[PDB]
Design a protein around this ligand. Sequence first.
Ligand code: A1A7T
Ligand code: A1A7T
Ligand code: A1A7T
Ligand code: A1A7T
Ligand code: IMP
Ligand code: IMP
Ligand code: IMP
Ligand code: IMP
Ligand code: K
Ligand code: K
Ligand code: K
Ligand code: K
Lengths: 379, 379, 379, 379
Amino acid sequence: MADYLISGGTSYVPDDGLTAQQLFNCGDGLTYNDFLILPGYIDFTADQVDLTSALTKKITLKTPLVSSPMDTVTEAGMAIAMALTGGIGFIHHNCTPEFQANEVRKVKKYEDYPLASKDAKKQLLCGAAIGTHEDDKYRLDLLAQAGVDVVVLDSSQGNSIFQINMIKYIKDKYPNLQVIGGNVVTAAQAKNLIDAGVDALRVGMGSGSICITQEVLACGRPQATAVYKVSEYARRFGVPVIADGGIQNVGHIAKALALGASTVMMGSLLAATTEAPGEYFFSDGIRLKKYRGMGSLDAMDIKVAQGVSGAVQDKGSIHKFVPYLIAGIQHSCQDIGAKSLTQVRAMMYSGELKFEKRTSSAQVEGGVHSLHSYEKRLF
Amino acid sequence: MADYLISGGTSYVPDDGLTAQQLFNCGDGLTYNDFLILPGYIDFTADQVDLTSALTKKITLKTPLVSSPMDTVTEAGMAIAMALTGGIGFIHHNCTPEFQANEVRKVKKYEDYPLASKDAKKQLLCGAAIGTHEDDKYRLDLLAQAGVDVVVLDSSQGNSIFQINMIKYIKDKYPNLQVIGGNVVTAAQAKNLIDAGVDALRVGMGSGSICITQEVLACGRPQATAVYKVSEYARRFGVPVIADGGIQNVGHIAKALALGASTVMMGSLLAATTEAPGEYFFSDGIRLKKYRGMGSLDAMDIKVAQGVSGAVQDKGSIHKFVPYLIAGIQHSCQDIGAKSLTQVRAMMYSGELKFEKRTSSAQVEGGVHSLHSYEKRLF
Amino acid sequence: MADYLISGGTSYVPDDGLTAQQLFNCGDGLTYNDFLILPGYIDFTADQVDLTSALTKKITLKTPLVSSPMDTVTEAGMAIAMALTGGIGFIHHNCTPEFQANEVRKVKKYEDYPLASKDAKKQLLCGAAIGTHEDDKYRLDLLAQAGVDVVVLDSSQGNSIFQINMIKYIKDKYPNLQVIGGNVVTAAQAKNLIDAGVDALRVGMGSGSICITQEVLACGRPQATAVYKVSEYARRFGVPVIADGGIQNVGHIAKALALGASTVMMGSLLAATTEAPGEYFFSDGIRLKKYRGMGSLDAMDIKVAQGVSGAVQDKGSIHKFVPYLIAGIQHSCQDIGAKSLTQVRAMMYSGELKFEKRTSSAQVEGGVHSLHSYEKRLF
Amino acid sequence: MADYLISGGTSYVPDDGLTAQQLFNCGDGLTYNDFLILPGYIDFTADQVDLTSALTKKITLKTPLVSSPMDTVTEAGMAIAMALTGGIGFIHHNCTPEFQANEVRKVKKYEDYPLASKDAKKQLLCGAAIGTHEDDKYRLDLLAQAGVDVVVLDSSQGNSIFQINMIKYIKDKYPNLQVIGGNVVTAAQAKNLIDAGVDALRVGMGSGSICITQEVLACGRPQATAVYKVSEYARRFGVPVIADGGIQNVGHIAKALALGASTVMMGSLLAATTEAPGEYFFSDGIRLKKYRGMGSLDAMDIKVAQGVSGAVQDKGSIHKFVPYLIAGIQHSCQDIGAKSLTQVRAMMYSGELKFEKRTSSAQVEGGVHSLHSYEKRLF
Ligand SMILES: Nc1ncnc2c1ncn2[C@@H]1O[C@H](COP(=O)(O)OP(=O)(O)OC[C@H]2O[C@@H]([n+]3cccc(NC(=O)c4cccs4)c3)[C@H](O)[C@@H]2O)[C@@H](O)[C@H]1O
Ligand SMILES: Nc1ncnc2c1ncn2[C@@H]1O[C@H](COP(=O)(O)OP(=O)(O)OC[C@H]2O[C@@H]([n+]3cccc(NC(=O)c4cccs4)c3)[C@H](O)[C@@H]2O)[C@@H](O)[C@H]1O
Ligand SMILES: Nc1ncnc2c1ncn2[C@@H]1O[C@H](COP(=O)(O)OP(=O)(O)OC[C@H]2O[C@@H]([n+]3cccc(NC(=O)c4cccs4)c3)[C@H](O)[C@@H]2O)[C@@H](O)[C@H]1O
Ligand SMILES: Nc1ncnc2c1ncn2[C@@H]1O[C@H](COP(=O)(O)OP(=O)(O)OC[C@H]2O[C@@H]([n+]3cccc(NC(=O)c4cccs4)c3)[C@H](O)[C@@H]2O)[C@@H](O)[C@H]1O
Ligand SMILES: O=c1[nH]cnc2c1ncn2[C@@H]1O[C@H](COP(=O)(O)O)[C@@H](O)[C@H]1O
Ligand SMILES: O=c1[nH]cnc2c1ncn2[C@@H]1O[C@H](COP(=O)(O)O)[C@@H](O)[C@H]1O
Ligand SMILES: O=c1[nH]cnc2c1ncn2[C@@H]1O[C@H](COP(=O)(O)O)[C@@H](O)[C@H]1O
Ligand SMILES: O=c1[nH]cnc2c1ncn2[C@@H]1O[C@H](COP(=O)(O)O)[C@@H](O)[C@H]1O
Ligand SMILES: [K+]
Ligand SMILES: [K+]
Ligand SMILES: [K+]
Ligand SMILES: [K+]
C-alpha cells in the first residue's frame, strides 16, 4: 500500500540542524566548545553500546582511549593500566633507548580485565615513540627487540622529508610493525604521509594544554576542524585517526569520535593519576603532580621553547577514572542514538547525525550558572 | 579491523551533483527539461525493475501510468486497455451521467495480461471524474451504482470550499470510495485537501499541452517544482501524488516519479491512439485525431476559455505503446541504480540520488544536433 | 632590492576572470558553448606548441585526437589514417569477432608521417571496442591475437558490476593490455572503475550528436562539467580522460583539453570523411554519408532506442582535416599563453588560467551576426 | 607517460584552508590573534631560512626587525644594537635637532656581527624621524649633515597635504635620501603617498600598546587587515611596508610578514631592554622601565591626548632577545614550508599558503589551559 510504496515505509524525518559537512564548510575555525551534537532516537540501553575502535589498520582496541607519549604521563605502569582497562599507552622517548626498551619489556612481560588489550600471544599491547633523527633508528631496533607492537613518529610537524624517509625505512626493515605518523592538521600532510605508507595518523597542533606553538610560530589549527578534515581525507584510504590535544572532558572525547576520529589521546586528563610518572606534592593544601610539554625548556634540559611546565591536581587511579570515561561515552552514544562508535561515524558521514553551533552566550548557558555556590562531582 | 570499523565498511562516495532539496531550493522555477538525473551503480538487469505504484492510499497498480479524464482521451475502451496493461483510466464527465455510468459498467463487466489491474472480484479497475457542483452528486450516485473504484474531483483549482464540501459529503455517504483531490501546485492547497480527507492528490496547473491558463489568468506553477513540493508535503501523511500535465516522453515520466510522484497521468501522449475516442482523419497525408482541452470553447459548447483544440498524430495501439513506456522506465531506473520506483524515491529523499541543472546550450547538446537529416525511431 | 625581495620579482597579475574550480562550483550545468577561455601572454610562436598527449597510463600520442568506435566512423582505413596523422582509432564491434580481428590485423600490418603513432615494433597503434557480455571474452581473445594495443569497454553506463568483472578478467588474463573504462560522468563511477584497475576513462553521456538518451531515460550530464569533474578526480590517481561526445569544432576540443581531458574522441566531426566506412550519396545536390548511433534501431537490426540515424555532409580526407585541427589547437594554446597541453592543464589546476561565462546574447555576439549573407571557409 | 603529461608531474594538493585574499574578503575586521597559518611541507632545516628584508626601495636588511622612533625605545645605543644584530633603529625627534643629530653621529661613527647592517662605507645604518611642520626642515638638514641613511615622517595620519609637501621637498633637496611615509591603513592613503614619491610605507593606526586613538577619535583599523590591504596595493609599485604596532610575540611578527609586510617595527617588545633609554626602577619587587606614547600628555609636556604612559618589565639585552626572535621566525618559516620570507609572501600571493580563522574558544584552546599553575620560559 501507499504507506510503504511512497518511500519504502521509512517515516520522514523533519530537517533540523546541520550536518558535519555543512558545519565545517563555513570556514569559521571551530573547536570542541563551539558546537553541540543534537539528540536522536533511543531504542537501547547504554550498556549495550560497543566502543571497539581501530588504533591502526591492523590493531583494534576495545576502547578508544590512548595515553600520550610524555615523560609526565606514560611509563610502564601507565601503559599496563591503559592496556588492562581496554586502551593502550605509548612510552615516551625523553630517555635513553635502553630505559625505553626496558619499560616496553616490563609492559610485555606483565602477568578480572575482560577488556584487556592483548596481542596474539595474550601479552599486553604496548606502543612507543621515536624521533625522525639518525640516532632514533638504533632506538627503534631496541624497541623492536623488546616486542613493541606499534611505534609513533613524534613531531610537532610530521609533514617532513625526514619523517617520510623514516617511515619508508621502518616499512622496509620492519614490514610487520605498525607505524603512526604525525602530527598533521591538513589534508595535504595526510596525503603525503599516507602515500609514504603509514597505518594511522596523529592529528593535532597547537591545541595541547601545555602547548604555546600557536603564539610562538603562528602555526596550527583548531582541533575539531583539523580532526574532521584529516579524518574525512584518511577515510578514503582506510587510515584511522588519533585526535591528540585539547581534550578536557568526556564531551570532548565524544565530539572528537563523532567528527571522524577513531581514537583519542590525552595527556593532561590522565596527568596526576597514580600510575603517571613522578611523585605527588602539596601546594596550599592541594595535591598536585608535575605535567610539562616535551618542548618546554625543562623537558629538553638558541632554543625556541614550544611548551610550558606546571602542575595538575590529583585525579586518582586509572582503574577508576577510565571506567567513568567509558560510561560517559556510552551515555553520549545512547543520547545521539548510536549503538556503536562505528555507527556514530557512519551517521555523521551520511548526514543523519546533526550538529548546532554555540554562541558565547550559548556556552555560558550550557555551563553552570545562576548559583551562589556549588560543588561538581562527576562520579 | 579499520576497513570496517571506521565507517561500517561502506566505501565512501565522492560528493558530486545536487540533491533534489538543493536543486529546488534555488527558487528558479524549474520544469522537466531544466535538469537531469545523474547515473549511479548497476548490479541488476532492467527486467528485474519493479514498477508497482500506489494510485491512492488503498489502491495499488503494477504500473504508474494513468489516462487523463478527457473527452478525447479516456472512454471505456481506453480504460479497459490501460487496466489490462497495468495502469488505470478515468472516465471523463463531459457527457450525461447515464453515459458515464454505462461506460463504467462496460469497463467493470469486461471479460495473457499478467499485469492487469483488478479489484477483489477479479474485475478490471475503473476510475471516473466528477465536478464540485450540486448536480455532480447525482452523477456520483450512478457512478457508485456502476461499481467505480475511485473518483477524481476535476477542477483547475481544487483548493475551494466547494471541493472540500464535496470531499466530506463523499466520505460521509461513501466511506469505502477512494477520492482524489486536485488540481493543486502548492503545499497549502495540499494541506487543505489532506485535512479534508483525500486519499491522493492530482498535481498540475498550466503545464497541459492544451492549456493556456497561465497566459489568461497568470496563475500556475512549473510542473517539476510543483510535483516535488506537493509530493514532499504529502509524503508526511502517506498521501500519493499523480503528476498531471507536461509529459512528452518517457524521460519526463521518470523525472516526475523521481521527484516524489507516485503516478503519472498523460492526456496528449495517449491521444491519437486507437483506443482513444473519435475517428482518425487525414491532413496533408498525415493521419491525425482530435485532441482538445476540457476548458476549450468547443468542449463547453461571457465564457473565459482556458484551453485550445487541435490534432495529434497517430501513435498506434495502447497495447504496444504502453510496453515501450514500461521498458523505458525500467531502463531509466537501472541507469540511476534503483531496482524499484520506491527505491528511487527513497534515494531521492535520502540525498543519495543526485541531479544537475541544464543550461539552454546543455539542452541543445542533449538533443539531436549536427546532422544534415535524421529519422527518430523510438521502438 | 625591494623589486625582487617583496614577492620574488614576479610582477603582480590583476585578478580578472574565474578559475575552473570557481566556474564549475556554481552548479549551473554548463556545456562547451556556455563559457570562454580568457587570453594570456604570448612569448612564442604557434608552431612550437607541443600536443603530446597520454591516451592511457602507458600509451602516449603526439596528438590528442581519437576516432570513435562506430560502424559509420572507424574501420581499418580510419584507424590507419588516424595513427599516421598522430592520433589513434578504435575499431567498432558491431560485427563478427573475426571481421574486427581482421581489421585490427590490417591496421597492424600496414606498411612522410613524422607524427605517426607506432608501438615498440614500429607498427601502427590500433584500438578496439568490446562489450561487457560473456561472448565478448572470445572476441577479446581474437583481438589479443591480432595485436591490438588497447581495448575500450563500450557502454552507455560503465559503472556496472559486469564492466568491473570484465576489467578484472582482462587484467588477470592480459596484464599488459591497456583497458579503457566508461562511459562515466560522475566521480563515483570514476572511483569504482579506477579501483577496478582501468588505465583510462571515457567521459560522456547524453552529449552525442546522435544520442537521445537524455530525453528517453532522463539520465546524463552536461559534457563540460562532466569532463572537468571526472578529470579532477582521475588526476589524483594518474588516470587520463577521453572526452567523448559533443565536439563540433576546434574550440570544443581546446575547451575539453583545458578542463582536464587528456584526449578527445569525435564521431560526427570525422564522419563523412573519405576514410570513414560507407559510400557517398547525393541528396538535393549535397554529398552526404550515413552516420548513426550504435543504439539506433538500424544499428541493432521490446527495444528501447537510445540513438538516431542520419547523414553528414562530406568533409574530405582525414590527411587534410586533421592538420587543420592540429593548427587550430596550437593557435588556441598560443592565445591562452601555453606552450603545451600539459602546461594548459597545469595552469588551469593552479588557477592561472581564467574563464568567463557566456550569456545567450554573448553567444549570439560571438558568432557571425549583422550580415546579409556570408560564406564560412575554415581553411 | 600519463604520470607527467596530465598536469606536469606535480602531485595534486587537496584544497584545505583559505587564502589570504579569501580570508580578508569577508570584511570581518581581523587582527593577528583572529587567525592562524596552516602548516606546509618541510624539506630543509630551520637554520637555512633567509630573513633578508627590504626596508625601502634601495635599503636591504638581513633581518626584518626595526625599532620604533620613541623617546623610551630608540636612542643611539638602541640603534647601534639593532644595526649590529641585523636590523635598524629610528632616532626619535622629541628632542632638540642638535641632540638628534648628535645621536645619529654617534651611531654613524661607532667602531663578531656577521649580520651587521652597514652602508657602502662600512658604517652602521641609522634612521631618524621628523615631523611635517616648517621647523622640521631645519632638523632634517642637521640629520642630513650627520649622515642619516633614511628618514621617516612621523604622524598618526600621514595622508595629509603637509606630508606630501614635505615628501616633495625632501625629494627635491635630497634626491638620494630614502623617505618613509605614514602612518596609513587604507589603499587610498597609500596611493597618495606613493604618487608623492615615498620609498616605503609605515602601516598602523590604533594598534599601538600605548595608543588610545580608536576610543578618542573613532579612527583606525585592525592591524592585520590594514597590513594585508596596504601591502597588496604597494606591491603593485614595488613599495615595501613596515607593520607598526600590535606586536606582542614572534607569532605576530611572522603573521605580519606573511600578510605582505616587508619589515616589522616594535615599540613595546623592545621596551625595558638594557639599550632602551631611561633607568630601571623597582615596584613590588618587579624591575620595570618607563614606556609612553609620543602623544601622551607626559611626552608633549586644549591638548587631546592620543596615548598613555606606563611601565614595562625588564627583558634583558637586545643582543640576546633579537636572536631569539630570529630563531622563532626561522622556525615559523620552516613550519609553513618556506626557505625565505620572500618565498612566504610569494606563496601567500599565489594562494599556496593557507590560513584559518580562530573563534574565541579556538584562541582559548591555542593558549595555555587546564593547568593549576605553570611557568612560561620562551628561551
Ligand atoms: N633527520 C633529521 N635531520 C636534520 N634535521 C632534522 C631531522 N629531523 C627533524 N629535523 C629538524 O630539527 C628540528 C627539531 O625538532 P623535532 O625533533 O622534530 O621535535 P618537535 O618540533 O616536536 O619539538 C621541538 C623540541 O622539543 C624537544 N622534544 C623532545 C621529545 C619529544 C617532543 N615532541 C613534541 O614536542 C610534540 C609531539 C606532538 C605535538 S608536539 C619534543 C626537542 O628538543 C625538539 O627540538 C625541526 O626543525 C626538524 O625539522
Ligand atoms: N458548487 C459550486 N457552487 C458555485 N460555484 C462553483 C461551485 N463549484 C465551482 N464553482 C465555480 O464556478 C466556476 C467553474 O469552473 P470548474 O467547474 O471548477 O472547472 P474548471 O475551472 O477546471 O474549467 C473551466 C471550464 O471548463 C469546462 N470543463 C468541463 C469538464 C471538465 C473540466 N476540467 C478542466 O478543465 C481541468 C482539470 C485539471 C486541470 S484543468 C472543465 C467548464 O465549463 C468550466 O467552467 C469556478 O470559478 C468555480 O470556483
Ligand atoms: N554481462 C552481462 N550480463 C547481463 N546483463 C548485462 C551484461 N552486460 C550488460 N548487461 C545489461 O544489458 C543491457 C544492454 O546494454 P549494453 O550492452 O550495456 O550497451 P548500451 O547500453 O551502450 O546501448 C544500448 C543498445 O545499443 C546496441 N549497441 C551496440 C554496439 C555498441 C553500443 N554502444 C553505445 O551505444 C555507447 C557507447 C558510449 C556511449 S553510448 C551499443 C546494443 O543493442 C545495446 O543493447 C544493459 O542494461 C546492461 O546493464
Ligand atoms: N605643516 C603643518 N602646518 C599646519 N598644521 C599642521 C602641519 N602638519 C601637521 N599639522 C596638524 O597639526 C596637528 C598635530 O599633529 P602631528 O604633528 O601630525 O602628530 P600626531 O597627530 O601623530 O600626535 C599628536 C601629538 O603628539 C605629539 N607627538 C610628538 C612626537 C611624535 C609623535 N608621533 C605619534 O604620536 C605617532 C606616530 C605613528 C602613529 S602615532 C607625536 C605632538 O604634540 C602631536 O600634536 C594635526 O592635526 C596635523 O594635521
Ligand atoms: O611541549 C609541547 N609543545 C607543544 N605540544 C606538545 C608538547 N608536548 C606535548 N604536546 C602535544 O600536546 C598533547 C597533549 O594534549 P593534552 O595534554 O590532552 O592537552 C600531546 O599528546 C602532544 O601531542
Ligand atoms: O482545457 C483545459 N485547460 C487547462 N488544462 C486542461 C484542460 N484540459 C485538460 N487539462 C489538464 O491538462 C492535462 C493534459 O496534460 P497533457 O495532455 O499530458 O499535456 C489534463 O490531464 C488536465 O489536468
Ligand atoms: O547510439 C548511441 N546512443 C547514445 N550515444 C551514442 C550512440 N552511439 C555513439 N554514442 C556516443 O556518442 C559519441 C559520438 O559523439 P559525436 O558524434 O562527436 O557527437 C560516441 O563516441 C559515443 O560515445
Ligand atoms: O602616543 C601615541 N599614540 C598613538 N600611537 C602611538 C603613540 N606613540 C607611538 N605610537 C605608535 O604605536 C607604535 C608602538 O607599537 P607597540 O609599542 O609595538 O605596540 C609606535 O611605533 C607608533 O607607530
Ligand atoms: K547549563
Ligand atoms: K544529444
Ligand atoms: K562574432
Ligand atoms: K594550547
